[PDB]
Design an enzyme around this catalytic site. Structure first.
Site, PDB file in Angstrom:
ATOM      1  N   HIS B  43       0.810  -1.223   0.000  1.00  0.00           N
ATOM      2  CA  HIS B  43       0.000   0.000   0.000  1.00  0.00           C
ATOM      3  C   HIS B  43       0.845   1.275   0.000  1.00  0.00           C
ATOM      4  O   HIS B  43       0.324   2.356  -0.274  1.00  0.00           O
ATOM      5  CB  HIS B  43      -1.030   0.025   1.148  1.00  0.00           C
ATOM      6  N   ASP B  99      -0.232  -7.561   2.060  1.00  0.00           N
ATOM      7  CA  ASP B  99       0.263  -6.193   1.902  1.00  0.00           C
ATOM      8  C   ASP B  99       1.787  -6.189   1.942  1.00  0.00           C
ATOM      9  O   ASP B  99       2.406  -5.886   2.972  1.00  0.00           O
ATOM     10  CB  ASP B  99      -0.346  -5.311   3.007  1.00  0.00           C
ATOM     11  N   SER B 198       3.890   3.096   8.010  1.00  0.00           N
ATOM     12  CA  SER B 198       3.560   2.140   6.948  1.00  0.00           C
ATOM     13  C   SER B 198       4.788   1.561   6.293  1.00  0.00           C
ATOM     14  O   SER B 198       5.675   2.306   5.895  1.00  0.00           O
ATOM     15  CB  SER B 198       2.792   2.846   5.830  1.00  0.00           C
TER      16      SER B 198
HETATM   17  C1  LIG Z   1      -8.137   0.988   7.390  1.00  0.00           C
HETATM   18  C2  LIG Z   1      -7.378   2.316   7.316  1.00  0.00           C
HETATM   19  N1  LIG Z   1      -7.551   3.056   8.559  1.00  0.00           N
HETATM   20  S1  LIG Z   1      -7.109   4.590   8.791  1.00  0.00           S
HETATM   21  O1  LIG Z   1      -7.673   4.972  10.053  1.00  0.00           O
HETATM   22  O2  LIG Z   1      -7.587   5.388   7.689  1.00  0.00           O
HETATM   23  C3  LIG Z   1      -5.431   4.684   8.863  1.00  0.00           C
HETATM   24  C4  LIG Z   1      -4.951   6.069   9.253  1.00  0.00           C
HETATM   25  C5  LIG Z   1      -4.702   6.391  10.582  1.00  0.00           C
HETATM   26  C6  LIG Z   1      -4.265   7.668  10.917  1.00  0.00           C
HETATM   27  C7  LIG Z   1      -4.076   8.627   9.927  1.00  0.00           C
HETATM   28  C8  LIG Z   1      -4.317   8.308   8.599  1.00  0.00           C
HETATM   29  C9  LIG Z   1      -4.757   7.028   8.263  1.00  0.00           C
HETATM   30  C10 LIG Z   1      -5.940   2.023   7.009  1.00  0.00           C
HETATM   31  O3  LIG Z   1      -5.161   1.738   7.913  1.00  0.00           O
HETATM   32  N2  LIG Z   1      -5.557   2.092   5.742  1.00  0.00           N
HETATM   33  C11 LIG Z   1      -6.392   2.427   4.582  1.00  0.00           C
HETATM   34  C12 LIG Z   1      -5.529   2.051   3.388  1.00  0.00           C
HETATM   35  C13 LIG Z   1      -4.093   2.085   3.883  1.00  0.00           C
HETATM   36  C14 LIG Z   1      -4.167   1.834   5.386  1.00  0.00           C
HETATM   37  C15 LIG Z   1      -3.266   2.784   6.133  1.00  0.00           C
HETATM   38  O4  LIG Z   1      -3.554   3.967   6.271  1.00  0.00           O
HETATM   39  N3  LIG Z   1      -2.157   2.280   6.670  1.00  0.00           N
HETATM   40  C16 LIG Z   1      -1.178   3.054   7.433  1.00  0.00           C
HETATM   41  C17 LIG Z   1      -1.323   2.713   8.898  1.00  0.00           C
HETATM   42  C18 LIG Z   1      -2.146   3.464   9.722  1.00  0.00           C
HETATM   43  C19 LIG Z   1      -2.310   3.153  11.068  1.00  0.00           C
HETATM   44  C20 LIG Z   1      -1.632   2.069  11.619  1.00  0.00           C
HETATM   45  C21 LIG Z   1      -1.776   1.695  13.065  1.00  0.00           C
HETATM   46  N4  LIG Z   1      -1.082   0.660  13.529  1.00  0.00           N
HETATM   47  N5  LIG Z   1      -2.564   2.314  13.847  1.00  0.00           N
HETATM   48  C22 LIG Z   1      -0.809   1.323  10.790  1.00  0.00           C
HETATM   49  C23 LIG Z   1      -0.644   1.632   9.442  1.00  0.00           C
END
Ligand SMILES: C[C@@H](NS(=O)(=O)Cc1ccccc1)C(=O)N1CCC[C@H]1C(=O)NCc1ccc(C(=N)N)cc1
Ligand SMILES: C[C@@H](NS(=O)(=O)Cc1ccccc1)C(=O)N1CCC[C@H]1C(=O)NCc1ccc(C(=N)N)cc1
Ligand SMILES: *[C@@H]1O[C@H](CO)[C@@H](O)[C@H](O)[C@H]1NC(C)=O
Ligand code: NA
Ligand code: NA
EC number: 3.4.21.5
Lengths: 11, 251, 28
Positions: B43, B99, B198
């Site tokens: 991603h 992923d 990420s």
């Molecule tokens: C399901 C979705 N949730 S999300 O809340 O939008 C993720 C997010 C958190 C904070 C700021 C911006 C984005 C998500 O995690 N997505 C949607 C598609 C890609 C992936 C991502 O953003 N991954 C990065 C990530 C974010 C949070 C975490 C964590 N461990 N809390 C890990 C990876």
């Protein structure tokens, strides 16, 4: 925000 | 990384920063697995719902870093990408299943005190270490809070969570190619990866041979460090056959 | 590869980082 990197890496 | 601490110098010498060429900015974390190969989350490179589709020439890899924003002269090394390989069954449509992506560097990077590869687990090390309650370590230059950015690389240790608890924490369909980690609300302690972390590594130090193994890749999470939510990680061992196939064919 | 996972500034010189013991203690 980021410090510029040497131009060689952007070529 | 939320509720972590500053890394020590050379603490995570496999840590890689994926850097966007223009505008110049952090794109993701990643890890060094050999002198020519870098591992990250798919991603980080491909996510159509957000119009993300990076090609080789868009990016650089910065290895040996500690400071987030500084150019660390005489310490970091910057590498160009030869080729990106994304898992052919990466599920960006639904739940980020599988992923995982590899990047081959144009030229081998020289190892140093600050630059050194992590191990990938074999079946036995994975079986032994991937157990609920066992702690791993996540590192990255991502956000310090869900809604700012760190001066230097951050680190947090987090326990692997029982699969049923992971499943019951979310409406998203979890798969065997994922695991989750983090403290429970009752456990008091906290911490999580976040946006910008990420693609970076979840590592564990084997008590059998004292080597660090990359068990996970920072993949997804609902917010960051929310009570009752957990961070989700790509299960590296489950996808190792693909990793080996790519390296054997193209390396 | 052969020396993967052994950090020059830690394992290779038999120095421990400040929190690795936390990991070891969890491997019960
Ligand atoms: C399901 C979705 N949730 S999300 O809340 O939008 C993720 C997010 C958190 C904070 C700021 C911006 C984005 C998500 O995690 N997505 C949607 C598609 C890609 C992936 C991502 O953003 N991954 C990065 C990530 C974010 C949070 C975490 C964590 N461990 N809390 C890990 C990876
Ligand atoms: C369709 C699905 N979208 S989704 O969660 O972003 C898809 C997705 C899941 C896991 C990793 C990467 C991408 C969704 O919205 N779902 C799946 C079933 C229920 C609902 C939900 O509550 N999702 C959690 C969630 C969704 C979006 C965000 C966000 N702020 N972007 C955060 C959490
Ligand atoms: C992403 O970019 C590649 C190459 O430019 C392209 O072939 C592909 O169709 C694009 N979209 C994807 C992989 O979803
Ligand atoms: Na559920
Ligand atoms: Na949480």
């Amino acid at each position: 925000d980021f410090e510029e990197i040497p131009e060689e890496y952007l070529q | 990384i939320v509720e972590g601490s500053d890394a020590e110098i050379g603490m995570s010498p496999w840590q890689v920063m994926l850097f966007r060429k223009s505008p110049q900015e952090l794109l993701c974390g990643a890890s060094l697995i050999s002198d020519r190969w870098v591992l990250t989350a798919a991603h980080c490179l491909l996510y159509p719902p957000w119009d993300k589709n990076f090609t080789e020439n868009d990016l650089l890899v910065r290895i040996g870093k500690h400071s987030r924003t500084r150019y660390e002269r005489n310490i970091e090394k910057i590498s160009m990408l030869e080729k990106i390989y994304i898992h052919p069954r990466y599920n960006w449509r639904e739940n980020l299943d599988r992923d995982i992506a590899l990047m081959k560097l144009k030229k081998p990077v020289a190892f140093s005190d600050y630059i050194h590869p992590v191990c990938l687990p074999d079946r036995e090390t994975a079986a032994s270490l991937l157990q609920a309650g066992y702690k791993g370590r996540v590192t990255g230059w991502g956000n310090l809070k869900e809604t700012g950015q760190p001066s230097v690389l951050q680190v947090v240790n987090l326990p692997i969570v029982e699969r049923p608890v992971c499943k019951d924490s979310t409406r998203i369909r979890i798969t065997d190619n994922m695991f989750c980690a983090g403290y429970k609300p009752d456990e008091g302690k906290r911490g999580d990866a976040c946006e910008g972390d990420s693609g970076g590594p979840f590592v564990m130090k084997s008590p059998f041979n004292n080597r660090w193994y990359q068990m996970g890749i920072v993949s997804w999470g609902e917010g960051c460090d929310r009570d009752g939510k957990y961070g989700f990680y790509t299960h590296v061992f489950r996808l190792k056959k693909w990793i080996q196939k790519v390296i054997d064919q193209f390396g | 590869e052969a020396d993967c996972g052994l950090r020059p500034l830690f394992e290779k010189k038999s120095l421990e980082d400040k929190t690795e013991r936390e990991l070891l203690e969890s491997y019960i």
